[PDB]
Design a protein around this ligand. Structure first.
Ligand SMILES: Nc1ncnc2c1ncn2[C@@H]1O[C@H](COP(=O)(O)OP(=O)(O)OP(=O)(O)O)[C@@H](O)[C@H]1O
Ligand SMILES: Nc1ncnc2c1ncn2[C@@H]1O[C@H](COP(=O)(O)OP(=O)(O)OP(=O)(O)O)[C@@H](O)[C@H]1O
Ligand SMILES: Nc1ncnc2c1ncn2[C@@H]1O[C@H](COP(=O)(O)OP(=O)(O)O)[C@@H](O)[C@H]1O
Ligand SMILES: [Mg+2]
Ligand SMILES: [Mg+2]
Lengths: 384, 394, 240, 880
């Protein structure tokens, strides 16, 4: 169990052999001196006899209850299920370290003393948002960009893989990243890829369900989210479409527009408040950046802002090349027509066109797609 | 050469480690049990001296007493109310009315006093730990530091000068200025330096589900503070909890207003708190309520403004003194190149210059990095800046 | 007694003082039976359709095909579509058709309206929304259906369509709603990629009304000579 | 997986060897043509270390193994050319041709004769071709031939030259971390026969690289911290001439040869001192060397620089005698004092305020006066806590107060007697003895001519009553603690040799005499042994005689790994077990710092428990107390294992040792500060523990916070102050709890008392620190012996700072930058040091315990370049 982490020679050098002998001899003598006494002073089994006595102290029916207060001096105030609470003692074999106010306890049936602790198999909301499997394909599936990817890697991935450049430089890596631009140009896609390659736990939540239907709930949700985020490990949090809180109103919201302000103040404090942050990164994205509160974006809460422009003819060519890989297509088609199909077609129109034309050819149980198929497919998807 | 020999030695010693680990006895993953060597004392004797001698002793709350002959009223949680007396081993003086007591289960007679409840959340709101920031990380604002330390800390460590001469020091202080200026950091500095307790509270923690909850929280907050000798309360982001009273039509913010009133009342009228100092902060203080800003509650109104010129060069000195950079660059020019900017921008400039050096291949940064960083974080991002809309204070 | 026979959520007798086990009891309780019995969805099939040929063609090729023939989409390789929207005047026959396909492809057709009776079955409080996924995966081949009469449903579907676009591992889950007035739905839902298909249901005309009369008059004792074509003609296209 | 077509290399070099036995005879031309083509092809195709799975290396042994077996040894007509193509090439696959048990078989291919200069075609390869073969041969063949029969055939004549040339080739390709592989051919080869290998490596490396010295130095010393006796002696003695012959470092020798002072030879250390006196280029090197040679890491040596030129050249040592101590007093007055100048008030101790909501405590208050008054803490009228108690009761209390007056003015020579004589006129058996001990303490370490036989001898000459006679031989020895003059030894010998009824005086005489001499004069140990032989015959009492007598002998023969002195001393005291109570004292006392785990295992093999029937209680106690040794500087591996052992065995399943004295082991372990201490000790200490002799718990409490370096954990002890009110009454712990609370911040600085300076060196401070741990046995000494020892037990604190100027005019104050402790082992590129660059300070106050500081502005610091805590900071600016 990590006896001696000084294994840094990691080679055929004499240091490793000598340290291994020293550990071996220490453990030899320790084994003899903690074994021979038990050979010569058993006095009882100590393997079942002591366990026999313990099983005797805790009577055969024993109840569950809730702890509510503790006085350190081995006896505390515990509640029963009915509602009336007591002032019982604490036995000594109960591991008086993992007792935290609220954990279930097992109480003796006669004198109600503290006997045992039940593991609290609850894990209620952790599993709802914590992504547990790789999203999809890495940076090889996205065509264009390159300038952006450099930055995302610098602010998210690179610190974890190579924590040697920065500390040598004396710089802490920049904190936050926001990605903004017109709709449907791959913000979420880059997020998925980053989740793919990375090693840290990835937590995702959409901004819209930050709002609720009762008072004093939004702040509770945000406190809980960041608590569970820092509970695990170096982790990455993704907050998506923030602008939704600041543009739409829903009747179920019992409060008015002031509770939204309260929620925003809570989130705004979570990033840089009175207490040490720990090791958590933040990534957020939106397509209306001119509506949210400029107090939220000041450096120290978010440093890199990356903008996503529309595709260009070279990138459009690359995109048509990517999205028709495993397509069994006839050489009759000419992509140059579709490149000039629209004045400013966006990236998602590409995948829309491809999938729709595939569907409409498969209508007739066929494998090859002709040109007139696209001629009707682009018209179907672009005009309505 | 002999990798196999040394590796097999390592394997044998690891196996022997786990072997003797089983041999002594810690195995069989527990459902709440301690290793046998620890409870050896409480296997034969502690059971026999902690099962027959000690009783259950239910816990109850006392209602009142009555005269000339002690007779007491006991209220338990789900049973009846009783009329009881005391036991011989406990003195009759220390059973002051209205506190938890422990009574036996047969004759129902008082045995021992107990400490009262205090809610579970308000207990965790204490600090119990102190951050790492010190007083040397606030370059540029010596005035404010002197002024605040003279109200929040000086009387505690020299409580004779004021008593000798005959003054009572103030009790409050407010900190305000545009975002990014650096008030929360001053609060951290104060927390690091002090010795008495220090309870931190954030305004959004004082909005609750049901009606009349926030007021209760404020009451027991100040009560728990009173229990101790004397210490600090830091409030953050006030403007979420009380601005002004503007009721019209249907009720709006009424509950939050009641919370604000209770907070106000706790500091004034009928035998005030005494040995407690508060400390607040905000971003847009124009919305604070007049009755809250009246002196007697907020004696000093410390103000944090945008750094001038010694502030900028000095912030550069502080945030760049841990850099591997060129030995012959001047930061005064850098101070001149950014007219109105906050400490945050200087921190980000240092970071981005380091990143430009690490970008290509270099090991130590030079002047061109700084000039490019200033050209990008100041002039290129300036369409997402708060300060043109937080100097009119809204 | 053996431990293995001691299943979770089982009724057992129990002696008085020692509280020791003694026997076993058959009855058990489940949530889904209670939620589905609250809902009362009407199972049906293709038999009752009148005048809905093309609509059933495309709804089947978008829904019924990519469960029984995933490899047929592997061959062409275009991804499997997941979002279908049905729109038209009220009372024209949306819900029955969605249930019809759900029955013909054997998927657990569940609908959600964000009410509170069934909320407790889903969870204790339901602070967030997607907890139904944690209940849907135990019965994976499922269809989510919603309806709008006269904006909460739109944000819910947006959260869902965002969810299962790369982050959800399980396959075989589709979502669909039906609502009128396309011109009023949100802008973010009109982007070419989010939704996959849109299908119009127009109010039935003469031939459709005649067929509907014939379908619904199969449980009634007619009379010799009705000329119900005249009856169909008298109705000036009300609805179905 | 297609085969054929491309089968050219895997066929032709497989078919030529198959017919090679038939080509051996009746075909002289073809055999040699094909042999040369195979040799050249295997040499060329195996030149680079990138194709480890060569198309010829792993494909010749499939069927050609029998051909190689029947062809090379079974030729019987070896020529002058076929052998060139056979031995040079067939031996290359012989490392991997056969199965794993091959190391004892290399003789049948290569050992006939090493082929020419095989490095000619094996110099461009890194870790594949032939150097691995050489390592394999040296692994078993050379070791088995030369174990006790080194003088033999070719297994040693050309093997040394081949090994030397391969080692030179190690620092020939890249000279990177593969140079650290040189020991794998030099240190690994002929371990116990390392003298000639090291001399060969030195003569090869003298002209190879001067800058490639420090790396090999540190590499060798990393294995030289612990080794066998012969290994340590040989390796250190061979490494000593390295920084002088090849490179000209010549500066760390004075500081790093303290490990080479005792373990190898003190005469060799004297030779190093002589050669250092020879090399006196300027003043930086000599001054930096002698800065730590009487105040840090030796003493009793100021007799070497008294030649005919003692003006400024040989007079420099004089400035270290008393001038450096005066500068120390001045810097305590200026640096630390200006920042903080307490009046010994103990206001911090008076922390009852903020929290809030007998004459025994006078001892604690007097200790509060003594502790905080360090670094020029003279008290004028502030000594009321001792002045009022000095003439009311508690003779031992007055004695302790007078003694603590000495520590109030610590390491002073200007006015210690001036302060002492103002109160010496007391006519008390206790005030006068404490006053003389205070006088000796004040000038202790100064090694000046304050009172060789003037102050304390005036008390000694009236030895007709205890205390007035006992406390008069220890204090003078403390004054001359750093000097080994035998004049004071003979003067104090009659104190012990008198065999007088003053048992306490004779014991403290043993302590006093042991704490001065550690080398020669076995006659003092002889006199002590004769005293114990003539004294302990008719007695079986407590350790009052035994807690003082054997300790002086043990210290006087402490830290010597020859063990011959230990064997003789143990054999000379053969007697009954009560008389032989000191048999195991000198046995372990000579084992301060070394790697001898065999001694550790035989320590507890003889006597583990024996059921502990009160028959060897003190014996097992002192056995466990001496088990604490070898862990103060265990190269970071012994400490963890030791603390785990003590936790597992004694306190968990034992008889009495664990629950009575297992807490001292942490005190002897370290005081750097680890959370497992402050979590494990209070685990057994928070509980009242009325079952066991709870006075042991009292000791544990009074010995818990012994960790120095003031920190923010004091709140724990204040919680104990809340738990110390009801239980743990004042009658035996009033001063002890407060002493625990003060132990961490005894002074506001001056806390280096951990007996580990430079890298891991002891600094000969065991003789002064140990007496506290020896006297703190557990019982019946906290009121008569504790107050007389616990006050002035430790006086070897290594100043308070590690960065300083000591320039010619003291112009510079401080210009440096600190980082964490060194944590680097191997790196094939630029080597590291520490990566905590965040701190950038220029103060001479706190320097940091486990920290390493570097400089800036590219000064190159050519004075010391390694370590010493008193860098000269020589100025060099040859780099615009
Ligand atoms: N440069 C591109 N390379 C490849 N695919 C692209 C590119 N730009 C857009 N796409 C396609 O467009 C689709 C829409 O992108 P995405 O879903 O990430 O939208 P978004 O930028 O987050 O915007 P919105 O907020 O409107 O959803 C992607 O799934 C991808 O298939
Ligand atoms: N005088 C200063 N010295 C050093 N750093 C400063 C100074 N003023 C500001 N900074 C830096 O700028 C940032 C200030 O943000 P901080 O978290 O303190 O919030 P604030 O300005 O108090 O208020 P808000 O939370 O409303 O933005 C910190 O990162 C700090 O490093
Ligand atoms: N074309 C039709 N054929 C048969 N029944 C129909 C038709 N149109 C409507 N109905 C009847 O009208 C009811 C409502 O169906 P539907 O239109 O799917 O729901 P909604 O009216 O909410 O869209 C169904 O119960 C069905 O019996
Ligand atoms: Mg998106
Ligand atoms: Mg703030």
């Amino acid at each position: 169990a990590s006896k001696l982490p000084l294994v840094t020679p990691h080679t055929q050098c004499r240091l490793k052999l000598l340290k291994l002998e020293r550990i071996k001899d220490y453990l030899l003598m320790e084994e003899e001196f903690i074994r021979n006494q038990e050979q010569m002073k058993p006095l009882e089994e100590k393997q079942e006899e002591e366990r026999s006595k313990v099983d005797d102290l805790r009577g055969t029916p024993m109840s569950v209850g809730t702890l509510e207060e503790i006085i350190d001096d081995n006896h505390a105030i515990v509640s029963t299920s009915v509602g009336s609470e007591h002032y019982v003692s604490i036995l000594s074999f109960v591991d008086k370290d993992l007792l935290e106010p609220g954990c279930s306890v097992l109480l003796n049936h006669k004198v109600h003393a503290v006997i045992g602790v039940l593991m609290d198999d609850t894990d209620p909301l952790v599993t709802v948002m914590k992504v547990e499997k790789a999203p999809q394909e890495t940076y090889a599936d996205i065509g264009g960009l390159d300038n952006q990817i450099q930055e995302i890697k610098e602010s998210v991935e690179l610190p974890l893989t190579h924590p040697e450049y920065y500390e040598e430089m004396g710089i802490k890596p920049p904190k936050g990243v926001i990605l903004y631009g017109p709709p449907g140009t791959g913000k979420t896609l880059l997020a998925k890829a980053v989740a793919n390659q990375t090693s840290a736990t990835f937590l995702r939540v959409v901004g819209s369900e930050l709002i609720q239907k009762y008072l004093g709930d939004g702040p509770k949700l945000v406190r809980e989210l960041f608590r569970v985020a820092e509970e695990h490990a170096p982790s990455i949090v993704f907050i998506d479409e923030i602008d939704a809180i600041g543009t739409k109103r829903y009747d179920s919201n019992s409060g008015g527009e002031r509770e939204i302000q309260r929620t925003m103040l809570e989130l705004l404090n979570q990033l840089d408040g009175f207490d040490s942050r720990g090791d958590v990164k933040v990534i957020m994205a939106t397509n209306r950046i001119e509506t949210l509160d400029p107090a939220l974006i000041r450096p120290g809460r978010i440093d890199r802002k990356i903008e996503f422009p529309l595709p260009d003819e070279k990138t459009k060519k690359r995109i048509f090349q990517i999205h028709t890989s495993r397509m069994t297509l006839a050489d009759d088609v000419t992509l140059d027509d579709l490149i000039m199909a629209k004045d400013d077609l966006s990236g998602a129109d590409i995948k829309a066109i491809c999938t729709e034309a595939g569907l409409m050819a498969l209508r007739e149980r066929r494998m090859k797609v002709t040109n007139e198929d696209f001629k009707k497919s682009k018209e179907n998807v672009l005009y309505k | 050469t002999y990798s196999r020999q040394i590796k097999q030695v390592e394997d044998d010693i690891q196996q022997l480690l786990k072997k003797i680990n089983e041999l002594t006895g810690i195995k069989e993953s527990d459902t709440g049990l301690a290793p046998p060597a620890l409870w050896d004392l409480a296997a034969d004797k502690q059971t026999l001296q902690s099962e027959q001698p000690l009783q259950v002793a239910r816990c109850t709350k006392i209602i009142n007493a009555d005269s000339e002959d002690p007779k007491y009223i006991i209220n338990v949680k789900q049973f009846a109310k009783f009329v009881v007396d005391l036991s011989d081993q406990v003195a009759p003086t220390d059973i002051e009315e209205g506190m938890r007591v422990g009574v036996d289960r047969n004759k129902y007679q008082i045995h021992i006093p107990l400490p009262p409840k205090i809610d579970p959340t308000v207990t965790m709101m204490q600090v119990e730990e102190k951050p790492d920031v010190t007083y040397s990380d606030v370059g540029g604002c010596k005035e404010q530091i002197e002024k605040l330390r003279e109200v929040v800390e000086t009387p505690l460590l020299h409580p004779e000068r004021f008593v000798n001469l005959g003054i009572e020091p103030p009790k409050g202080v407010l900190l305000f200025g545009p975002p990014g200026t650096g008030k929360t950091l001053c609060a951290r500095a104060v927390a690091n330096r002090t010795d008495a307790c220090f309870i931190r509270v954030i305004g959004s923690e004082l909005v609750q589900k049901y009606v009349g909850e926030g007021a209760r929280m404020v009451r027991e907050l100040f009560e728990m503070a009173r229990t101790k000798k004397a210490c600090l309360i830091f409030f953050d982001e006030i403007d979420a909890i009380g601005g002004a009273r503007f009721d019209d039509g249907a009720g709006g913010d009424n509950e939050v207003q009641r919370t604000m009133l209770e907070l106000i009342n706790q500091l004034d009228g009928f035998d005030p708190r005494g040995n407690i100092k508060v400390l607040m902060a905000t971003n847009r203080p124009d919305t604070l309520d007049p009755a809250l800003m009246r002196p007697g509650r907020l004696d000093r109104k410390i103000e944090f403004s945008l750094p001038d010129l010694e502030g900028r060069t000095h912030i550069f000195k502080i945030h760049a003194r841990s850099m591997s950079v060129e030995r012959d660059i001047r930061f005064e020019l850098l101070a001149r190149l950014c007219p109105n900017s906050t400490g945050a921008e200087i921190r980000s400039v240092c970071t981005e210059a380091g990143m430009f050096a690490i970008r290509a291949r270099r090991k130590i940064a030079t002047e061109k990095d700084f000039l490019e960083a200033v050209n990008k974080v100041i002039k290129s991002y300036a369409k997402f800046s708060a300060t043109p809309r937080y100097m009119t204070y809204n | 007694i053996d431990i293995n026979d001691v299943t979770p959520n089982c009724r057992v007798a129990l002696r008085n003082d020692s509280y020791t086990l003694h026997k076993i009891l058959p009855n058990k309780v489940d949530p889904l039976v209670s939620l589905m019995m609250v809902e009362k969805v009407p199972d049906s099939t293709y038999e009752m359709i009148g005048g809905l040929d093309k609509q059933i063609k495309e709804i089947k090729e978008v829904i019924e095909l990519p469960v029984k023939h995933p490899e047929l989409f592997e061959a062409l390789g275009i991804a499997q579509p997941k979002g279908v929207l049905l729109y038209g005047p009220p009372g024209t026959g949306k819900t029955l058709l969605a249930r019809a396909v759900a029955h013909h492809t054997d998927c657990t057709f569940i609908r959600v309206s964000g009410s509170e009776l069934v909320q407790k079955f889903i969870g204790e409080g339901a602070r967030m929304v997607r907890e139904l996924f944690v209940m849907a995966r135990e019965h994976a081949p499922s269809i989510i259906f919603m309806d709008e009469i006269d904006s909460e449903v739109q944000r819910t579907m947006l959260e869902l369509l965002n969810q299962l676009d790369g982050f959800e591992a399980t396959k075989n889950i589709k979502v669909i709603m039906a609502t009128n007035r396309i011109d009023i739905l949100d802008s973010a839902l009109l982007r070419p990629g989010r939704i996959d298909r849109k299908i119009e249901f127009p109010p039935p005309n003469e031939e459709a009304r005649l067929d509907i009369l014939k379908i619904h008059s199969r449980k009634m004792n007619l009379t010799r000579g009705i000329n119900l074509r005249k009856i169909a003609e008298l109705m000036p296209g009300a609805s179905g | 997986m297609e085969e054929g077509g491309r089968d050219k290399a895997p066929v032709q070099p497989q078919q030529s060897p198959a017919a090679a036995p038939g080509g051996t005879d009746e075909k002289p031309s073809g055999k040699e043509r094909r042999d040369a083509g195979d040799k050249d092809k295997e040499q060329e195709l195996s030149e680079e270390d990138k194709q480890l799975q060569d198309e010829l290396e792993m494909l010749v042994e499939r069927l050609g193994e029998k051909d190689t077996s029947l062809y090379r040894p079974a030729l019987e007509e070896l020529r002058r050319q076929i052998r060139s193509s056979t031995t040079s090439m067939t031996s290359v696959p012989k490392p991997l041709k056969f199965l794993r048990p091959h190391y004892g078989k290399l003789k049948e291919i290569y050992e006939n004769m090493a082929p020419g200069e095989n490095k000619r075609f094996a110099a461009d390869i890194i870790s594949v071709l032939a150097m691995t073969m050489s390592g394999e041969r040296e692994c078993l063949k050379y070791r088995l031939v030369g174990s006790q029969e080194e003088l033999a055939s070719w297994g040693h004549e050309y093997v040394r030259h081949l090994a030397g040339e391969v080692a030179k080739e190690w620092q020939e390709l890249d000279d990177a971390e593969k140079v650290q592989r040189e020991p794998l051919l030099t240190l690994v080869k002929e371990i116990v026969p390392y003298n000639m290998a090291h001399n060969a490596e030195h003569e090869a490396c003298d002209l190879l690289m001067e800058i490639e010295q420090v790396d090999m130095l540190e590499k060798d010393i990393d294995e030289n911290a612990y080794a066998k006796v012969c290994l340590y002696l040989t390796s250190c003695v061979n490494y000593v001439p390295e920084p002088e012959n090849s490179a000209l470092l010549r500066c760390a020798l004075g500081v790093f040869r303290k490990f080479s002072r005792f373990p190898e030879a003190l005469r060799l250390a004297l030779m190093l001192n002589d050669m250092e006196l020879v090399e006196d280029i300027f003043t930086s090197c000599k001054d930096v060397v002698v800065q730590k040679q009487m105040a840090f890491m030796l003493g009793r040596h100021g007799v070497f620089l008294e030649l005919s030129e003692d003006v400024e050249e040989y007079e420099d040592l004089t400035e270290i005698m008393s001038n450096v101590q005066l500068n120390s007093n001045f810097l305590a007055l200026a640096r630390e004092l200006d920042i903080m100048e307490p009046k010994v008030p103990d206001d911090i101790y008076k922390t009852h305020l903020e929290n809030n909501r007998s004459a025994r405590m006078n001892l604690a208050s007097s200790f509060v006066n003594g502790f905080v008054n360090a670094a020029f803490g003279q008290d004028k009228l502030l000594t009321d806590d001792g002045n009022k108690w000095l003439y009311k009761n508690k003779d031992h209390g007055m004695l302790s107060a007078a003694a603590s007056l000495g520590m109030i003015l610590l390491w002073d020579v200007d006015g210690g007697l001036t302060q002492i004589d103002k109160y010496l006129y007391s006519s008390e058996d206790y005030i006068k003895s404490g006053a003389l001990l205070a006088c000796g303490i004040v000038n202790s370490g100064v090694r000046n001519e304050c009172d060789p036989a003037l102050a304390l001898l005036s008390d000694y000459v009236l030895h007709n009553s205890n205390t007035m006679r006992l406390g008069s031989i220890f204090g003078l020895g403390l004054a001359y603690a750093g000097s080994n003059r035998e004049d004071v030894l003979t003067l104090l010998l009659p104190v012990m040799g008198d065999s007088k009824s003053s048992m306490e005086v004779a014991g403290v005489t043993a302590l006093a005499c042991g704490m001065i001499a550690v080398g020669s004069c076995n006659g003092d140990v002889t006199s002590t042994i004769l005293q114990t032989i003539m004294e302990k015959s008719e007695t079986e009492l407590k350790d009052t005689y035994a807690r003082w007598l054997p300790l002086g002998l043990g210290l006087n023969h402490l830290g010597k790994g020859e063990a011959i002195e230990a064997i003789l001393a143990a054999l000379e005291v053969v007697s009954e077990p009560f008389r032989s109570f000191a048999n195991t004292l000198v046995d372990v006392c000579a084992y301060a710092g070394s790697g001898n785990v065999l001694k550790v295992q035989q320590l507890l093999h003889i006597c583990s428990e024996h059921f502990d029937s009160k028959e060897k209680e003190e014996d097992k106690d002192k056995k466990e107390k001496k088990d604490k040794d070898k862990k103060e500087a265990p190269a970071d591996m012994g400490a963890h294992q030791g603390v785990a052992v003590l936790g597992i065995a004694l306190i968990a399943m034992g008889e009495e040792i664990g629950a009575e004295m297992a807490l001292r082991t942490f005190g002897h372990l370290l005081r750097y500060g680890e959370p497992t201490l402050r979590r494990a000790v209070p685990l057994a200490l928070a509980l009242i523990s009325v079952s066991n002799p709870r006075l042991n718990i009292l000791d544990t409490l009074s010995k818990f916070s012994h960790d120095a370096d003031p920190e923010v954990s004091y709140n724990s002890i204040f919680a104990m102050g809340m738990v110390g009110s009801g239980t743990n009454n004042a009658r035996l712990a009033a001063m002890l709890r407060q002493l625990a609370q003060y132990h961490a911040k005894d002074p506001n600085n001056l806390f280096m008392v951990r007996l580990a300076q430079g890298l891991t060196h002891l600094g000969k401070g065991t003789l002064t620190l140990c007496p506290y741990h020896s006297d703190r046995q557990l019982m019946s000494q906290v009121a008569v012996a504790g107050l007389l020892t616990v006050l002035v037990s430790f006086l070897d604190v290594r100043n308070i700072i590690l960065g300083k100027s000591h320039y010619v005019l003291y112009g510079l104050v401080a210009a440096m930058q600190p980082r964490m402790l060194v944590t680097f082992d191997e790196e094939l590129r630029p080597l590291p040091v520490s990566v905590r660059v965040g701190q950038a300070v220029d103060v001479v106050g706190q320097a940091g315990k486990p920290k390493t500081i570097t400089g800036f502005q590219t000064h190159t610091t050519p004075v010391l370049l390694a370590h010493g805590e008193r860098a000269e900071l020589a100025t060099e600016e040859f780099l615009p």
